[PDB]
């Protein structure tokens, strides 16, 4: 396991497991000469051999879409099930943990009514809106799969983990994505969970409303389906 990976990579590549398929970090770039790269670390995702192929293809497609923030696809070995990705995020100060949306929300949960929090969550909604506007679905849109990248005093939301992603123009899939995130945010039982989701939805809507009349109609469709999904999501 760790054996097969280390043998495949050889002792020249340092690895540290972070999640277990299995995810590692490494400080070694898979092909640029040492010291000719420009990032402290990278991600390696190993899946014994079609999520590997699926995630690689989608990361590449999404990068080309203006405004969409996803990790760089650095290297792909589809024969052995390895992909190397840009490492996004960092450790929040005060030991609040890795800067995914979940930990960020928890960190600010006692005092969330700030420009930072609302603005950041609207940016989260904008990423999802761009995704859906362009007819893509994430497939596992939890608060753990949204990673905040520091930009001075601001945060730049990125989407990660597209193993279950897909191309889809179906409002049903768009509604389910939104519902999955809505429920993940609510599951913390925070008093402010509803507000958080409302800020996210504001950014989502702004994306569609920037698209004139066609965007407004597409928005109504998605928001209608999304309300239906909420209804069908609870016991009746």
């Amino acid at each position: 396991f760790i054996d097969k990976v280390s043998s495949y990579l050889t002792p020249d590549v340092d690895i540290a497991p972070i999640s277990q398929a299995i995810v590692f970090t490494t400080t070694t770039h898979p092909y640029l000469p040492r010291a000719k790269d420009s990032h402290q670390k990278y991600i390696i995702k190993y899946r014994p051999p079609h999520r590997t192929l699926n995630e690689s293809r989608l990361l590449a497609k999404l990068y080309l879409i203006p405004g969409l923030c996803v990790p760089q696809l650095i290297a792909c070995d589809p024969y052995n099930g390895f992909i190397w990705l840009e490492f996004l995020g960092e450790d929040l100060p005060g030991g609040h943990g890795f800067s995914n949306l979940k930990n960020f929300l928890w960190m600010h949960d006692q005092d969330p009514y700030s420009d930072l929090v609302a603005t950041t969550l609207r940016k989260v909604g904008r990423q999802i809106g761009l995704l859906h506007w362009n007819d893509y679905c994430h497939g596992d849109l939890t608060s753990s799969n949204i990673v905040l990248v520091r930009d001075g005093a601001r945060w730049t939301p990125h989407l990660i983990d597209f193993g279950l992603g897909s191309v889809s123009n179906l409002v049903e899939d768009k509604g389910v994505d939104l519902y999955v995130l809505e429920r993940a945010i609510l599951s913390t039982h925070s008093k402010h969970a509803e507000k958080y989701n409302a800020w996210i939805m504001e950014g989502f809507e702004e994306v569609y409303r920037e698209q004139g009349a066609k965007g407004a109609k597409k928005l109504k469709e998605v928001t209608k389906r999304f309300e239906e999904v909420r209804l069908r999501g609870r016991k009746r």
Binding site: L9, T10, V13, P30, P33, A60, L64, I74
Partner: protein, 177 residues
């Protein structure tokens, strides 16, 4: 000139050199049978990241899938391209009769050190031109974004602010072979 290794393939060295004011591209092409190097058109290469990503794909392909071409040198020209068609890769990514710059690439599979002095002598015996450092500063002089967009089929909506942005899209195409 630079000699490099891919981490997971410590025993395979690759030499890369860049030439400008090249005068005998037509001659090089006509003798490309007689000579082993790959002679690559720098108009399609915007960065080291791009080139090394193709070298990585080449080694992965040969080791774990299938080699399509004669040797590693030609396989890398194929892997630079977004296409499966070998002839089209050789044509688009190989030097042209009118090339005034070129990248000279060579895989060295033997253990034992690359004889750099001998390599530089061989290359200058082949290429009538002026070697400059293989680095991103020099590669940024000679790539043709318009041609790259056409060859890698990039949409006009894709508007990278810098070479890093463009390079990222090309590495994607390369890795998704």
């Amino acid at each position: 000139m630079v000699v490099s290794i891919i981490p997971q393939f410590p025993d395979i060295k690759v030499s890369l050199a860049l030439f400008e004011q090249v005068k005998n591209a037509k001659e090089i092409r006509s003798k490309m049978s007689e000579l082993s190097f790959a002679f690559i058109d720098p108009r399609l290469v915007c960065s080291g990241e791009q080139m090394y990503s193709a070298i990585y794909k080449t080694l992965i392909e040969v080791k774990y899938n299938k080699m399509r071409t004669r040797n590693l040198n030609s396989e890398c020209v194929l892997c630079l391209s977004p296409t499966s068609n070998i002839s089209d890769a050789f044509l688009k990514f190989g030097i042209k009769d009118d090339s005034s710059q070129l990248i000279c690439l060579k895989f060295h599979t033997n253990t034992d050190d690359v004889d750099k002095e001998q390599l530089r002598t061989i290359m200058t015996s082949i290429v009538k031109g002026q070697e400059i450092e293989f680095n991103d500063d020099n590669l940024s002089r000679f790539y043709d974004e318009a041609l790259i967009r056409k060859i890698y089929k990039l949409s006009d909506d894709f508007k990278p602010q810098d070479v890093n942005g463009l390079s990222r899209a090309l590495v994607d195409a390369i890795q998704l072979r």
